[PDB]
Design a protein around this ligand. Sequence first.
Ligand code: FMN
Ligand code: FMN
Lengths: 216, 216
Amino acid sequence: DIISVALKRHSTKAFDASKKLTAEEAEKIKTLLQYSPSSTNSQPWHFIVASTEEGKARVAKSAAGTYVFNERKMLDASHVVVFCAKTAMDDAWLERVVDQEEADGRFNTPEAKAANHKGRTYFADMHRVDLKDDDQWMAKQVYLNVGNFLLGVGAMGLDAVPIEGFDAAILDEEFGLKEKGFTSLVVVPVGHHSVEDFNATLPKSRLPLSTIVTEC
Amino acid sequence: DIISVALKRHSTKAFDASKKLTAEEAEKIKTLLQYSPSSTNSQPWHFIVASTEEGKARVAKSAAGTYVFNERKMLDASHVVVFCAKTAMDDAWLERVVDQEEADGRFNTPEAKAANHKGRTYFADMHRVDLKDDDQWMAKQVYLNVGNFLLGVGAMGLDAVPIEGFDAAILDEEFGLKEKGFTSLVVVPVGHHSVEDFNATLPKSRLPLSTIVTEC
Ligand SMILES: Cc1cc2nc3c(=O)[nH]c(=O)nc-3n(C[C@H](O)[C@H](O)[C@H](O)COP(=O)(O)O)c2cc1C
Ligand SMILES: Cc1cc2nc3c(=O)[nH]c(=O)nc-3n(C[C@H](O)[C@H](O)[C@H](O)COP(=O)(O)O)c2cc1C
């Protein structure tokens, strides 16, 4: 029951450094990252999936100073996913998206593909040209991916914890994302919580529906 | 299997206007909106859940002109959720969150509550003062909620379609959101797709893992 999952999944505060994801689970979390929806199927993202001790150590460089209290989560987890967004929407990327859709058989005619491309470009330009906010627009799609991911891993019976408490400048530099056209937004360690993960047993807390929801 | 859900859910292009969510399902989608995680559990959001004909018609007003291709989705779906983000992070809201967590028994000691309050304040301020980007920060949390929601309704066997193709200015004005301290970001009609939903049978398309994922 997905509703039970939502009422049960939690932000892991401690991971068992001995429990690793199975090969199948590792394949599945990558599938979750890949198949998340996005505006115009723009998929303005890239993901770093660190599973080796060296890889996790590189990501952990971002848990410096003020963020040092997040270091252990990044080091003890089985797999650590760094969610990155494109820094600018280039035509090259838009072309890749529409060409992939054609390859997957989503268009019944060439005109249909051209129309899809025109439309995606039209909305991309709305952000790139008019609003000048394509960077924030794409970052938003990445957070949506994070939302999809957290519930998905929870539904897999796996533990995870979303992290904004990291130095993105440091992380970007460590992986040369700037030069690749990406920037890190959220770090998500995934694995199995340890017995010491006190947050696994604390009740979930949210504001009441009477405050957050308006029915019409 | 949640992975089968991710590989099967799709953006509904046509809903069967006669199929409504059951009372239980209507309560469950609200639970999904409410329990989505967010940075510091800030829950910087508000949701309009329109299920009456006039309610949906009012939301549909935002799908005028260029966006008319999204009008029928909003009108025919059973429940249409308008995802809104707060326009500014006020101290009262921050206090509400910690006080709610205290009320929910998440703090065994006063020191525990203090640590939580300290942490939230530090990062809320980082965005409200240091970066002056709390509007974008909260919007990001709302998109995360959307990602959680789409996968959730999918796992419930319900159809939906996320929508950015609407005039937020019109929608905000229609529901007097600005005066209430909110702004609309994404509209999500939820229901059951009709056999005329061309996207229900089209293959899902995403760029290859070799392009979007880096393993370390
Ligand atoms: C934030 C967001 C906004 C979107 N807006 C629209 C919209 O206005 N109309 C529409 O038909 N689809 C819309 N889409 C659906 C995308 O085209 C879709 O998610 C993508 O092509 C991948 O297909 P899927 O959702 O079937 O997996 C939106 C998706 C997201 C995630
Ligand atoms: C974008 C985002 C960033 C977050 N960052 C951190 C972090 O840096 N460290 C941490 O321990 N928890 C972090 N959290 C966890 C929140 O405190 C948590 O999601 C929230 O309190 C609700 O509790 P839940 O996830 O157990 O349901 C983050 C959550 C989100 C959604």
